[PDB]
């Protein structure tokens, strides 16, 4: 109900789910969606389709605030990370630009055994 027009789409991709968060021109979220918000309960959430849905859902809930253009920002490597981007490019929501900002340590905390394997 604040007619934002333009903002930011955050794609959090991982091997278990994809969660999209649409925010206003300076970080604050407007609406978000995810693989679980769309019914996929098990591991279907990680599937690329779930990403495509989660994105579309996110965009639609955004148009409700008169959103026209948005800057995408991806974080993570999991599947559906690319469908999420494409979904937003087919959602009438003008993708102003795409930027990958996955956080990576400059070698800090000792990772879980799972993420150490051969180092």
């Amino acid at each position: 109900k604040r007619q934002v027009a333009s903002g930011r789409a955050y794609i959090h991709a991982s091997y278990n789910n994809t969660i999209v968060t649409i925010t206003d021109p300076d970080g604050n979220p407007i609406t978000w969606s995810s693989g679980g918000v769309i019914g996929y309960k098990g591991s279907r959430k990680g599937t690329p389709y779930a990403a495509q849905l989660a994105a579309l859902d996110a965009a639609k809930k955004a148009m409700a605030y008169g959103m026209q253009s948005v800057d995408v920002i991806v974080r993570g490597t999991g599947a559906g990370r690319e469908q999420a981007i494409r979904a937003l490019q087919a959602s009438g929501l003008q993708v102003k630009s795409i930027v990958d900002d996955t956080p990576v340590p400059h070698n800090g905390c000792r990772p879980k055994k799972k993420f150490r394997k051969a180092s």
Binding site: V74, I98, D100
Partner: peptide
């Protein structure tokens, strides 16, 4: 800088 955001994709 130490790291910048990759723009593209």
């Amino acid at each position: 800088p130490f790291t910048e955001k990759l723009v593209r994709k």
